[PDB]
Amino acid sequence: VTDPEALLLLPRLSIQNANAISSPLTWGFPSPGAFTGFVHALQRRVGISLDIELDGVGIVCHRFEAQISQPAGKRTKVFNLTRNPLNRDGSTAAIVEEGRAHLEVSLLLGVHGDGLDDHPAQEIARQVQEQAGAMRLAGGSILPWCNERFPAPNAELLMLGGSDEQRRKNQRRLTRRLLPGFALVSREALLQQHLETLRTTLPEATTLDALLDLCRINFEPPWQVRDKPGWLVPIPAGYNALSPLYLPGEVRNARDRETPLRFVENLFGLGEWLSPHRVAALSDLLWYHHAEPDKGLYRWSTPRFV
Amino acid sequence: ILSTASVLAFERKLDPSDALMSAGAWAQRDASQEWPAVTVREKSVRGTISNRLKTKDRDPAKLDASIQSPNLQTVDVANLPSDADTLKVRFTLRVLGGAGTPSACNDAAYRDKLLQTVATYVNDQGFAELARRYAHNLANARFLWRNRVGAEAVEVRINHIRQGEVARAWRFDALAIGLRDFKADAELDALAELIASGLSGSGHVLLEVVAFARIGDGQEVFPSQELILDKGDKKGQKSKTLYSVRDAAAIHSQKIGNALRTIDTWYPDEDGLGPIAVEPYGSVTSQGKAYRQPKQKLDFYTLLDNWVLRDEAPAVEQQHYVIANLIRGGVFGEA
RNA sequence: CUAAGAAAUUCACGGCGGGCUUGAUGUCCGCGUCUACCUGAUUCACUGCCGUAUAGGCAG
């Protein structure tokens, strides 16, 4: 919704047990809503004190590993679980299945404000780093890189370069920093285009079928495979309203009594994993919140991509 | 009236990482940054029926017929190499601040009263005893569990990491420090002071804990076993699956946390077990029995409700237990 | 203010019995690899002498 004055590269963050249950219909990498909420929590905890704004996150996923196993004779997968403590009567409690995964990500935070000129870039980058070093990203702790060969320092780069050549070189070197990874972007326009193509293929087709078709492996007879432009994962695109907006005190057992509570339900959209060299500017990968509370549509997305 | 909060939650303070397992030789523990990792392998086991019979399978003909069918299983096994006798277990520990602050809570008066209760506790005696017991659980190799059982000598090295380097280093003999007695030692008091300062701070204090256990040359080590539900599939599965992060056997983070939480020696039952993990309703998974039952007035919920609502302050040991539960975390609150 | 907040999978195990893989076989005709270059830039920081000297000078 806004152009950042600088990009804050949080370095390789080792996330221990992230919520691999991204949505009621998808598993694997955590939802972009988790990353946007983590960035908003960074702004709420240290961004205000630095007189800056932290909006926009770039997700690169240098390494992924989910605690999953494949049972013998089945082609699907199951989630490895944890042994919860026993009940008060000494019996095993009912198992609630949750997926927990290991990440290694580096985040590009969009920074705009007066604290960029008020404070040195290295100082605010550092203070954001040790602020994030005691937080959670997707339900998992953050490993702070102690006593390895060398830690990766935080680096903030102002987008207003002295020249176009200097800006282009800075963008390419920042891309070289987060090279063993794949940027995560959203493909709502591609999903709608494929849905229109599917509707011309056969009518009364919903966007759920278009989203399923763009992710499944399709086999066509002469036996070939329908190729995909990219990786094309299905991701939760936000939340849609399910109930009228209640007052902060109406809902029993709320998180607090100062915030209105509205029941919602997941919105499923299209996403893409792509190498960071295939983006014009690294600020095009930033994920933003788009609430629009009048009609629900509590959405997160990455605009200005193409 | 100070009604208790409908939604109550506490963040997990004192959270460790996965205990990476690696192997090497004793008297080379200093140059152990390049020690090769312990790998989880596969092997086949053929056993025989040895469980109790249900008075109908005790016929000799049926027993012999069932023995004549071979019992084959595939298990995950982790071993030290045939030229290495020392198992090195390394993990990272973050001691988070804001220890008494709830993560989610409804009632604002309950917020003020609970924060007042924690303030009274911290300016009365603080985390002196709790961090002492946590530093003891760090100093002895309780997080090795079955790896600590038959080791010739165990040494635990704990380093404080401030920016990127060792601000302060510790070295302990884990077998000398008991698993049930919490004495006082100068280095242990320094570690307890650091942990208490981390708990009372606003940021976090980072510790790496490296334990060397002289298991034996080529012996069998015990990483954490993974919980996988069979879910009634027709194919036979592997009976034992071990945990590994990147081709390297590891121990689960919650397993290490349960090892660190074993500080509760104030439960109403006798301390024949010794310390137990700090949990609501005092549950012990190995003993199958939950001490601190709610029929007695020593469970966490009733103690907290009497302490914060009716201002019935419990004993100092029960206050330590309640604050240790606050360190542990959990999702609380009635409907 | 992160489908937020919380969690011990674990004890025990004999996989082995035995075995002939052998029979036969044409790889093969033909072929233009050329042209043109500064290794050397202070590239030998070397040998001896006065002085206890590693402190510091001197000789061709």
* DSSP sequence for A245-265: ---TTTSTT-S-SSS----EE
Residues B294, B202 within the same domain:
no
Residues B113, B140 within the same domain:
no
| Helix, coil or strand: residue B45 | strand
Residues A188, A282 within the same domain:
yes
Dihedral, CA of residue B148, residue B149, residue B150 and residue B156, to nearest 10: 20
User: Cα–Cα distance between A69 and A39 in angstroms, integer?
Assistant: 32
Dihedral, CA of residue B318, residue B321, residue B325 and residue B328, to nearest 10: 170
- Helices and strands: H and E segment counts in chain A: 6, 15
Among B300, B333, B335, B302, residue whose Cα is nearest residue B7: B333
Residues B89, B164 within the same domain:
yes
* Count of domains for chain A: 2
Residues B274, B328 within the same domain:
yes
Kindly state the DSSP code that residue B294 receives in the 8-state scheme: T
Cα–Cα distances (Å) from A286 to A18, A110, A117, A300, in that order, read: 21, 7, 22, 10
Helix axes B253-260, B128-139, angle to 10 degrees: 120
DSSP B266-288: -SSS-TTS--EE--GGGEETTTT
Cα–Cα distances (Å) from B170 to B159, B209, B210, in that order, read: 6, 9, 10
Among A98, A20, A31, residue whose Cα is nearest residue A236: A31
- B7 touches A at CB < 8 Å: yes
Q: Give me the count of residues in chain B.
A: 335
Residue B258 phi/psi, 5-degree rounding, is -65, -35
Give the DSSP H or E segment for A171.
Answer: helix A164-177
C-beta neighbour count of A252 within 10 angstroms: 10
Residues B236, B223 within the same domain:
yes
Question: How far does A197 lie from chain B, in Å, by closest CA?
Answer: 41
Print the domain residue range for B268: 1-11+99-126+263-335
Question: How far does B94 lie from chain A, in Å, by closest CA?
Answer: 8
**A236 with A267: CB under 8 angstroms?**
yes
As beta bridge partners, residue A275 has: none
Q: Which residues contact A14 (CB under 8 A, 6 or more apart)?
A: A102, A103, A104, A142, A143, A145
- Cβ of A172 < 7 Å from strand C? no
| Mutation to test the A interface, candidates B3, B6, B247, B292, most A Cβ within 10 Å | B6
- B284 touches A at CB < 8 Å: yes
Question: Do B285 and A69 lie within an 8 Å CB cutoff?
Answer: no
Joined together, the tokens standing for residue B194 give 């650091």
Residues A243, A172 within the same domain:
no
Indicate the residue among B262, B287, B321 that finishes a domain: B262
B24, with CB counted inside 10 A (0-12, 13-18, 19+), is buried
Joined together, the tokens standing for residue A100 give 């927990």
Residues A40, A169 within the same domain:
yes
**A125 with A154: CB under 8 angstroms?**
yes
Q: Sign of the CA dihedral B225, B226, B231, B235?
A: negative
**B67 with B1: CB under 8 angstroms?**
no
Residue where the block lists tokens 């960074």: A42
Looking at the partner chain, which of A89, A141, A253 has a beta carbon nearest the beta carbon of B290? A89
Print the domain residue range for A211: 182-302
Indicate the residue among A181, A208, A224 that finishes a domain: A181
**A266 with A26: CB under 8 angstroms?**
no
Residue A213 one-letter amino acid: D
User: Cα–Cα distance between B165 and B159 in angstroms, integer?
Assistant: 9
Indicate the residue among A148, A181, A214 that finishes a domain: A181
Residues A30, A117 within the same domain:
yes
Indicate the residue among A125, A147, A181 that finishes a domain: A181
| Helix, coil or strand: residue B174 | coil
Question: Do B235 and A80 lie within an 8 Å CB cutoff?
Answer: no
Residue where the block lists tokens 């920042």: A174
Residues B58, B186 within the same domain:
yes
Residues B227, B326 within the same domain:
no
Joined together, the tokens standing for residue A25 give 């219909």
Q: What is the structure's resolution, reported in angstroms to one decimal?
A: 2.8
Indicate the residue among B246, B262, B278 that finishes a domain: B262
User: Cα–Cα distance between A138 and A158 in angstroms, integer?
Assistant: 28
Residues A126, A243 within the same domain:
no
**A118 with A85: CB under 8 angstroms?**
no
DSSP B295-310: TTTTSHHHHHHHHHTS
User: Cα–Cα distance between B207 and B204 in angstroms, integer?
Assistant: 10
Q: Give me the count of residues in chain A.
A: 306
| Helix, coil or strand: residue A3 | coil
| Helix, coil or strand: residue A158 | strand
Residues A157, A199 within the same domain:
no
**B80 with B218: CB under 8 angstroms?**
yes
User: Cα–Cα distance between A299 and A270 in angstroms, integer?
Assistant: 13
User: Cα–Cα distance between B281 and B269 in angstroms, integer?
Assistant: 13
Residue B300 phi/psi, 5-degree rounding, is -65, -40
Q: Tabulate helix, strand, coil % of chain B (nearest 5).
A: 25, 30, 45
Residues A105, A208 within the same domain:
no
User: Cα–Cα distance between B168 and B194 in angstroms, integer?
Assistant: 10
User: Cα–Cα distance between B282 and A73 in angstroms, integer?
Assistant: 40
User: Cα–Cα distance between B333 and B150 in angstroms, integer?
Assistant: 43
The arrangement of strands across the sheet holding A183-186 comes to A183-186, A264-274, A233-241, A298-301, A288-290
Residues B293, B155 within the same domain:
no
As beta bridge partners, residue B274 has: none
Indicate the residue among B234, B262, B290 that finishes a domain: B262
* Count of domains for chain B: 2
Residue where the block lists tokens 């599939």: B233
Joined together, the tokens standing for residue B197 give 């300062």
Residue where the block lists tokens 């539960």: B325
CA atoms within 13 A on the CB side of B330: 17
User: Cα–Cα distance between B143 and B147 in angstroms, integer?
Assistant: 9
Chain A residues touching residue B105 (CB < 8 angstroms): 256
